């Protein structure tokens, strides 16, 4: 067949969000609140193109907007966030429910210094709409032309010409 095209290693260099999973899980509700638009443009491009090579730049925007999400935490509320993700980080299942007062301190300092409202129960699971400028893929599966169907039956049904025509049976 053909050669599969791959992007170069410079096309894959972006500054990584090099924080732990409890750090990501601690700020995840405010992350889904504040980093909505580039994340949803990326996941729309990712379910529509069905190809990650066509989804690099939007992904870079994700990694552009996540870092600016954490810098904006690090400039303002580094200590209550640190006290919060440490308590998230203790738990083996990483329970939100074991960590409600540290969550309250982090949410208080974030609403005071950044004005961010934490999403409620049922908001980040909504199907939202995304206004992009990229065109709709007319053939995301790269499917070739389908075979033409067999001709259907038409014409009025006539009797059998002289019956069964089986050796001597005249009907």
């Amino acid at each position: 067949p053909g050669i599969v095209e791959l992007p170069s290693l410079e096309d894959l260099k972006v500054q990584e969000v090099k924080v732990s999973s409890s750090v990501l899980k601690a700020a995840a509700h405010h992350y889904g609140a504040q980093c909505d638009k580039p994340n949803k443009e990326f996941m729309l491009c990712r379910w529509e193109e069905k190809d990650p090579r066509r989804c690099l730049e939007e992904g870079k925007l994700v990694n552009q907007c996540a870092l600016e999400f954490f810098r904006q935490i690090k400039r303002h509320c580094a200590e209550p966030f640190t006290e919060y993700w440490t308590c998230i980080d203790y738990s083996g299942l990483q329970l939100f429910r074991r960590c409600r007062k540290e969550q309250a301190q982090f949410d208080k300092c974030v609403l005071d210094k950044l004005g961010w409202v934490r999403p409620d129960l049922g908001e980040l699971s909504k199907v939202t709409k995304v206004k992009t400028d990229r065109p709709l893929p007319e053939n995301p599966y790269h499917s070739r032309a389908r075979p033409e169907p067999n001709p259907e039956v038409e014409g009025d049904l006539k009797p059998a010409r002289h019956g069964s025509r089986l050796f001597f049976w005249t009907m």
Binding site: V19, S20, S21, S22, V23, F70, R71, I73, Y90, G92
Partner: protein, 70 residues
């Protein structure tokens, strides 16, 4: 009298207390002073292997926070 059965019950209770306290102290020792990560589900395993990558020292439990980003 009836308190003569209590030394054997206390010895058997220490023998039942040893495995739980043992596995609690060992899980705190081997995991950076914290609980062992429970990975029943593949998302938990993905986050745990991503922690092992982002720690830089090949350990999932070495946590990196805001100080790791600029």
């Amino acid at each position: 009298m009836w308190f003569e059965v209590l030394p054997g019950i206390a010895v058997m209770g220490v023998c039942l207390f040893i495995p739980g306290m043992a596995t609690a102290r060992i899980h705190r020792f081997s995991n950076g002073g914290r609980e062992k990560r429970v990975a029943h589900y593949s998302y938990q395993w993905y986050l745990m292997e991503r922690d092992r990558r982002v720690s830089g020292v090949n350990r999932y439990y070495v946590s990196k926070g805001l100080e790791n980003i600029d």
